[PDB]
């Protein structure tokens, strides 16, 4: 604790540049820090959590403040379909005059926003820059508060005990009823009091919200139980959003489908959704036994779920202790569920646009889908990484004897071998069918293509009421008890939306959609295979039966026993990242091309070209690259210059990653030795001495540095393309 | 914007002065 890093004496004693790198890379692995106790670990994490939350509120503050100060929110409200929202001003003294003009948006040099903040803020009732700014100040206070809380809870009297941190039943009650439930109840309050009034051109703010009742009938219906009153007189189908013209009085409805003007969910549906959700969460958070002698014990629930056959051995006996005592098990489950939520957000927000006019902001739609699927992809890789770490660091076989978790390890070869089978099957046949299609199309015979109708997915569209395919099942059947039950509620609005081919609600699907879905299945299964193999072999294999003794991350076990490069569970994380990027690539390529085709009104292009891979390269990548790569050229530059420059930058970063991934350490260490030699023997230069002996990056470090360049290049390349291709085209 | 001078002060600060100060501070911190 007398040289960086203070938390590792083993690193601090390292006389080489490795000390600095490993200091940075291990700074947050609190468990492995010198003299770390379980109590200090939890308390450090809790305080770090306050830091991270404060960061989220400062970032959000920044976005509100920049739009308030430098944006065109007020001008965008006036004309949301034509006006481009501004992110923030550019001040760059490297700009030539031509670049200042190219990026001039009105009277300001500025970036256009593709984050959808204007659409969201406008939908939730924000109407002017002073309201945004008030938001910014409000969130600076929230940041400051969390920084105070963070600071308080690492002061001796305010450090919570380990028993506090392992109070599962209490945290679940509060998080369900309070964090989810009451937040959703309070948010309902915002929609009913502020957002819905704002949608009907009625200003409700801090100035008047005490006096201005969000419904004419007040709270008399709510206490008399005459709740139908709140659903009467919804906004007409002629309602001009932000105005009273065709406005209703309803605050809670079940209209289904879209506001025809804003092509977004009804605010009164979203109000009533959140009321329903709030109640479900408040009830759900009264499940678990705290201090009042009612509710469930989570251990008692788990221990009871042992099938009497003995087919799951001891069932869930021991799982309670295993989960409660492992932060990595907890982080794994949390990342797994959050990943799924992030993917569901991506899928549901494009299909059922919540925000006024954002269906028309094509760049924002594409940006948001892509952003969230890459976050979801990172989260699920992380979930499995912490699954693997859990197995090495926290899993005790003796405490999990013959339970569901121990039984996974018992048949790991059955699991891995079957994931291998499904991956091989999907890979052979998906690549096979695409290559069949490419060859017969290349030979001028597209009628010889294997074009398998996605009839199961088409049948599901028909169950939700899509008439197009000729199936008359459930909601697409007039006589179904499913149809008749919903006819007076959401079904008219929903059927209108689902049978409209202009929106993204249950897009029409054909053979193109069949093939890419099997590509997506291949990617999910293979990424899963790598991560699961990583987790189930983390503790040991036939090649390294004592792997758990070497920990999550180590270079290898040397060239003996045939050679052991990339044997650590960390190496499975490293390999899975490539497959995650590849898979999210296929997903987001598919989303983007399907939407470009829809938005152009040339669905036929996607339908015909998507069934062979040259179609993707030519009609998606090559065709849509033109606006991007002409951001600058010999004749001049335009506002896409920054995406053109970023695009090349990202290709460079991607390719630089290959150096670290392909060329390994020994080459570099030998080269550095000659440079050290040269420096010491060069006059004048040799008066200057390094304090840290320069060495080549470590074996694992280069995998990480290579993967970061690869990942950054991968993401920035696609970001520049998906933005510039969409912005350039519309 | 209203305070259109501010980017002329803060972008150099965040972009040149503060990164040099931070690099200088971290250099001394990791070399002592």
């Amino acid at each position: 604790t007398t040289k960086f890093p203070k938390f590792s004496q083993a690193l601090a004693s390292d006389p080489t540049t490795r000390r600095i790198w490993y200091g940075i890379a291990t700074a947050h692995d609190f468990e492995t820090h010198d003299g770390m106790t379980e109590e200090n670990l939890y308390q450090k994490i809790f305080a770090s959590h306050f830091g991270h939350l404060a960061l989220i509120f400062l970032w959000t503050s920044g976005n509100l403040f920049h739009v308030a100060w430098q944006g065109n929110f007020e001008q965008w409200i006036a004309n949301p379909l034509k006006t481009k929202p501004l992110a923030h001003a550019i001040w760059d003294p490297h700009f030539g005059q031509a670049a200042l003009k190219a990026f001039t948006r009105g009277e300001t040099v500025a970036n256009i926003s593709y984050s959808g903040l204007y659409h969201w803020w406008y939908t939730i009732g924000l109407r002017n820059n002073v309201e945004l700014y008030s938001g910014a100040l409000g969130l600076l206070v929230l940041s400051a508060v969390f920084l105070l809380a963070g600071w308080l809870h690492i002061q001796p009297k305010f450090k919570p005990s380990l028993s506090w941190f392992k109070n599962n039943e209490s945290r679940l009650n509060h998080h369900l009823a309070g964090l989810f439930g009451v937040s959703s109840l309070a948010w309902t309050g915002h929609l009913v009091h502020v957002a819905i009034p704002a949608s009907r051109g009625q200003h409700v703010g801090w100035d008047n919200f005490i006096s201005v009742a969000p419904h004419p009938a007040g709270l008399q219906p709510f206490f008399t139980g005459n709740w139908s009153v709140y659903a009467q007189s919804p906004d007409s189908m002629q309602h001009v959003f932000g105005t009273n013209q065709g406005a209703g009085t309803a605050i809670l409805t079940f209209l289904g489908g879209f506001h025809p003007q804003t092509q977004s969910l009804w605010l009164t549906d979203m109000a009533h959704h959140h009321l329903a959700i709030a109640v479900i969460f408040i009830v759900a958070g009264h499940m678990y036994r705290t201090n009042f002698g009612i509710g469930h014990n989570l251990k008692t629930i788990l221990e009871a779920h042992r099938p009497p056959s003995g087919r799951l051995g001891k069932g869930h006996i021991g799982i309670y202790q295993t989960l409660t005592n492992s932060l990595h098990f907890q982080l794994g489950l949390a990342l797994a569920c959050l990943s799924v939520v992030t993917s569901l957000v991506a899928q549901h927000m494009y299909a059922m646009p919540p925000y006024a006019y954002m269906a028309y902001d094509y760049v924002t739609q594409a940006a948001l889908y892509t952003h969230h699927q890459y976050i979801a992809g990172l989260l699920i890789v992380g979930a499995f990484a912490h699954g693997a770490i859990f197995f090495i660091r926290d899993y005790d076989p003796e405490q999990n004897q013959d339970n569901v978790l121990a039984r996974m390890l018992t048949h790991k070869e059955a699991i891995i071998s079957h994931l291998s089978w499904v991956s091989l099957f999907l890979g052979f046949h998906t690549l096979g069918l695409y290559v069949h299609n490419d060859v017969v199309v290349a030979f001028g015979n597209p009628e010889k293509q294997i074009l398998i109708e996605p009839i199961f997915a088409q049948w599901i569209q028909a169950t939700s009421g899509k008439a197009l395919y000729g199936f008359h099942v459930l909601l697409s059947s007039s006589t179904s008890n499913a149809t008749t039950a919903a006819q007076q509620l959401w079904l008219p609005g929903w059927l209108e939306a689902i049978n409209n081919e202009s929106n993204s609600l249950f897009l029409t699907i054909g053979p193109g959609d069949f093939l890419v879905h099997h590509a997506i299945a291949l990617g999910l299964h293979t990424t899963t295979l790598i991560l699961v193999k990583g987790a189930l072999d983390a503790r040991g294999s036939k090649l390294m039966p004592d792997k758990k003794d070497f920990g999550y991350s180590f270079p290898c076990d040397g060239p003996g026993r045939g050679g052991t490069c990339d044997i650590s569970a960390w190496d499975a994380f490293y390999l899975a990242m490539f497959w995650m990027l590849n898979t999210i690539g296929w997903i987001t390529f598919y989303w983007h091309w399907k939407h470009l085709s829809l938005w152009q009104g040339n669905v036929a292009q996607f339908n015909e070209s998507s069934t062979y891979l040259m179609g993707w390269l030519r009609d998606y990548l090559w065709l849509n690259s033109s606006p991007l790569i002409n951001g600058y050229n010999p004749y001049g530059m335009n506002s896409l210059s920054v995406w053109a420059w970023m695009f090349l930058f990202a290709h460079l970063v991607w390719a630089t990653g290959f150096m670290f991934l392909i060329s390994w350490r020994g080459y570099w260490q030998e080269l550095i030795e000659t440079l050290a030699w040269a420096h010491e023997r060069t006059p004048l230069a040799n008066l200057i001495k390094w304090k840290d002996k320069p060495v080549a990056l470590s074996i694992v470090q280069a995998r990480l540095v290579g993967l970061v360049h690869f990942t950054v290049g991968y993401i920035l390349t696609y970001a520049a393309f998906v933005i510039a291709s969409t912005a350039g085209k519309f | 914007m209203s305070a259109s001078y501010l980017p002329s002060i803060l972008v150099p600060t965040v972009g040149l002065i503060l990164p040099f100060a931070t690099m200088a501070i971290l250099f001394v911190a990791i070399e002592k």
Partner: peptide
């Protein structure tokens, strides 16, 4: 429109967050 005063009020509150952030950072 956001006034010079409003931008400077934001900066003093951001300064306060800076102070409280350094206080937390120094302790963690």
């Amino acid at each position: 429109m956001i006034t010079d005063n409003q931008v400077f009020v934001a900066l003093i509150m951001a300064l306060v967050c800076g102070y409280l952030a350094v206080k937390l950072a120094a302790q963690l």
